[PDB]
Amino acid sequence: MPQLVPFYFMNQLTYGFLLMITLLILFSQFFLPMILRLYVSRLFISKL
Amino acid sequence: MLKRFPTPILKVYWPFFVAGAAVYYGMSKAADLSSNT
Amino acid sequence: MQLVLAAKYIGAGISTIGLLGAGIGIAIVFAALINGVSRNPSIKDTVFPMAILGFALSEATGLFCLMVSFLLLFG
Amino acid sequence: MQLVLAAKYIGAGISTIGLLGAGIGIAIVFAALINGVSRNPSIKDTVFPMAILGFALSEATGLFCLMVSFLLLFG
Amino acid sequence: QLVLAAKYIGAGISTIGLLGAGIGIAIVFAALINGVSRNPSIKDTVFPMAILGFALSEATGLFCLMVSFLLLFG
Amino acid sequence: QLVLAAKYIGAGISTIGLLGAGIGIAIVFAALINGVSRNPSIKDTVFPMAILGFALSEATGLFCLMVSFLLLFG
Amino acid sequence: MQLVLAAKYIGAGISTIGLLGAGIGIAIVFAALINGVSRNPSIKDTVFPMAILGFALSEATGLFCLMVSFLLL
Amino acid sequence: MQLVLAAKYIGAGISTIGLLGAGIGIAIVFAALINGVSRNPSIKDTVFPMAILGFALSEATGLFCLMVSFLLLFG
Amino acid sequence: LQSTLDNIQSARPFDELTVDDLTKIKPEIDAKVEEMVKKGKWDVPGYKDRFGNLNVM
Amino acid sequence: LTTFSLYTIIVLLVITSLYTLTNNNNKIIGSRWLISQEAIYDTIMNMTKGQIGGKNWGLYFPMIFTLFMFIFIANLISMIPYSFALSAHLVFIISLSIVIWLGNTILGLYKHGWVFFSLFVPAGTPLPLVPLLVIIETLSYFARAISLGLRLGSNILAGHLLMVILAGLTFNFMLINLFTLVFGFVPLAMILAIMMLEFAIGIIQGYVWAILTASYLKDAVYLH
Amino acid sequence: DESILLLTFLGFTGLVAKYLAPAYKDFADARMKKVSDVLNASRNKHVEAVKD
After folding, report:
1. Widest CA span of chain I, in angstroms?
2. Environment class of residue I45 by beta-carbon count within 10 Å: exposed (0-12), middle (13-18) or buried (19+)?
3. K31 lies within 8 A of chain I by CB
4. Could you give the domains of chain H?
5. Which chain J residues touch C59 with a CB distance below 8 Å?
6. CB F58 within 8 A of CB F21
7. Which chain regions cross the lipid bilayer (chain B)?
8. Which of K26, K49, K27, K29 is nearest to K37 (CA)?
9. Do C53 and I57 touch (CB under 8 A)?
10. CB-based contacts of G49: which residues, under 8 Å, 6+ apart?
């Protein structure tokens, strides 16, 4: 059916792939190591 | 809080990114082909 | 024409048949849950999440059929 | 016209088929309820609310199907 | 004309839904007989639950049947 | 336009293939719950095996769905 | 023309029905695998090759139906 | 003319339905194999040729359906 | 030791404190976090042995 | 630009707020809001440690985390009544799925050579049926290509469409004379039950994607 | 049509405020407490050692 066909496909996909790369880096460099700070700090308190 | 710690696994995600570029380009051509329908 | 609008309606009717398999499916998962819980007693902490998971996927097959039914009928 | 109006009724009839699966589904849930309770004598307090979940979920598939039958029939 | 023919045909097709309920009731009653034969004594508790189960299983078939009448008369 | 009508018919028929897979999925998960409740401890090995089985059973249904889309889009 | 092309699309639709049997079949093999393995424990390594063979054969029936669909299309 | 070509295609589609029963059948024989080997731990050497035999016979039924499908399709 | 006890008395978080201050007093915090990101880990070993592991199934 | 572009921006900013200012005083005890993103962290640590072994699981832990979190957030945001779907734009979900399938295939070829093709003999079998089991392993391997995406896309799309169709129908049900507006609440409650279900299958689908493509990475990292 | 979706969402938030918001309060509190207690225990543990 033509209802699931926009011709705006490349528009959709461009903004879409921009969001994915952004979230991936954002987690990976920033927010994942920031959780790891809580964990490691808790374990250092556990040691002391 | 927020401090940048390098994740060297962003360059381990090279096969994922190569695939992403191919589909990105391919959808440009697909969009052009469907607008001629 | 008359035939095409008719064909949307007919094609939709046929599409609805697909749902029955999911319906029975959902019940089978819940049966297995009830059997399992009565058999073990205490398995439930792991198993209740597993059963909900199984429910969801059985349901999803139904949703595929349902969405196709809508697609033909409504456009 | 005559064909389109006809198609409402025919398409609805075909749609009504899907309902059978939900009926069987409910039977499977209640069968399992009985089966479990006969094994334990005592599982029932946990199992009865679980069974109501299974009933509702299986029934829902039937209601979606019934909705489509009405959408075809009534418009 | 075609509309009249169509409703008779459609009424036929809708009746098939009842098929599942006819099996359904038996699956509940089978489990009742199996359970009580297993326990000798579950039945006082189990029988109310079984009648609830019977009603619900039949009820789905009745939805098919009321649709069948909406087609058949309508 | 007979072809367009027919496309919609062929699609309708295609959903029927999906029903079998819907049951199939439930059967795999039923087996999971059954096995796990019998053993307890098997679960950690078996849950991956189950996930594989889910995918394989699902794939047959995917084919039925894909043919539905192939008709639908034409 | 119209009728023949129409018939191809319809016939293809009918062919999908054949696949459903394979779908149920595959599930039965895996269900059996889980049951067997949970019953024995230790059988699993022997059973897993047998299971793969059984999976393949069940799938194959569906495949035959699928290629017939392709012929009609 | 058109009708005869159409009919050949229709008949082929219908014949494809026949195969499904064989599909389920093959699985059932293998299910028994798995259950048997887990039941005995040691049945496998006798039972494996039995399983193959049962497979072949079940498969053959589907094969008959398939050749009739081709026969109608090609003419 | 009197001084050590006193040092513990006038500073002792268990109410809440910045993770930055624990990092500041022990740069071991940043060293371990960096080493774990470099290693390709996100499990802190021992964290789960006296803190949760928050999962259901 | 496009409506789609506008809601992708909303997703990015929502995810930023969950770590940037979840805490007050950058707690060592952890804020009550931050308990949610701890539980998510731990169950995905234990999920991708759960599937893929080695210390290599932590090498794919961000990838599995942003595939979790994207779908987890986008099956709450897309369920807002007037919010414009990104997941019912199937072309984004399916494209991402094909990308991941190719990025598994390329990773597998790169890491494990032409003995990557040992993935498609997954068991010793009689020699005349060694090739059969390659054909219908490779067939199932790119059935995994479209299965992963199309499952999620259909569920979310179907949820919105089901809800809207019944909503349009229940408007005209209440328009029937007032004895029908008595018991006009029972279909409204049905739509509520459906909306609840769309959240459920949305959180479940976020887990199902991420466990299945944890299973696919298990296959890719360890041959077979 | 679309106002029905907003009415259901409002009802959903009603169920949330009834059931989920106290449950999540209790859940978050419980975990937070457990963490706090472990941390304070460790602090206690080293204070004992000083006294020894």
Report:
1. 49
2. exposed
3. yes
4. 2-75 (1.20.20.10)
5. 197, 201
6. yes
7. 9-25
8. K29
9. yes
10. J123, J124, J125
